[PDB]
Amino acid sequence: VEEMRSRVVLGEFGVRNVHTTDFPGNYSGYDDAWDQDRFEKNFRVDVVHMDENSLEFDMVGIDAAIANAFRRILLAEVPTMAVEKVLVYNNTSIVQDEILAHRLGLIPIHADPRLFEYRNQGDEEGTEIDTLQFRLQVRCTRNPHAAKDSSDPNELYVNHKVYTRHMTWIPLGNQADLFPEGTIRPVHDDILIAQLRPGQEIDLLMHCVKGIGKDHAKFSPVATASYRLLPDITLLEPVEGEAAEELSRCFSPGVIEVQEVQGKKVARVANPRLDTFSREIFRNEKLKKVVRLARVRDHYIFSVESTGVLPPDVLVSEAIKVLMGKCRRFLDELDAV
């Protein structure tokens, strides 16, 4: 007669169970029929950090299926713009043509994909509606004003290294209005595309189309969008007297804060969230009996890091909206019968 409703207990030789006991018929009284108000009451979102290119909200009180749906949407279904076709007029570089096209596909563009649309199948030409064109034209020459020196930038250098700065947007249609001068640009100005020697030249036109990270990774808008369940650490016994420090070393260092309540030293669990699961207490043989570390049941921690095309919060919003769009597409196709 003992219920544990909220934690995923764990030892070393394996974890105890894979359930969450929050579904219909999963208890004598604790049965579920998807009370929507109970959800709307027990749900809360909390954001730990929001630099540019980072977010760490909490998303407390949701199941693993919905959290995983959100994570898989950000990685593979939120749309981005990226180079699909490369027209090469001349290329006397050491970098091949196909390898140059590949390298150009993996460069992130700062166009927001919500103002564009998908190119129809076999729309090779493209129009202001679905495409953005950029041009890289660079040639390397020796600089006339150079002494007998060997630094590659000083001599043998007008364009020794071709960067993303060298790529220039060719406004395709009326896109010069709508897009102000600096808005459509590659996100990073320092990505090394190639290297040149005097007499070598690159000249090409790149076409960027819309797409999702599912049919090619180049179109994916986040470095990673993973999540982790909130750890839980409980001191079953008061640790003290120089075993507190050994305890504080078997964890990521901020988790067990050793206070000094009396002349003796007491270890306390200051911040369970910092913990990385390393299970190094389980090697102690005397303190594996003192601490129980498990996971909180439906308390997640998310971390979204965008490449630079869209801000992270906008990414999460568009992910939730993409899931809603899936649901609505299937609802309206069902209503079609």
Partner: protein, 64 residues
Amino acid sequence: MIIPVRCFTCGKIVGNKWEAYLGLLQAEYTEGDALDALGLKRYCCRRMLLAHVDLIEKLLNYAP
């Protein structure tokens, strides 16, 4: 040959930290401190720069 533009396992863009990495190593910084000062947290990205062999500098030495 040349620095990969995006880390393979994750996709994080590491193609702009090659010259910065080389500059922090010329200043006396260890490869660990250097990879930290560039923002490469998870070791999948750290291996992308730590173990890169720049062979574009040896191919760019035979005649035009």
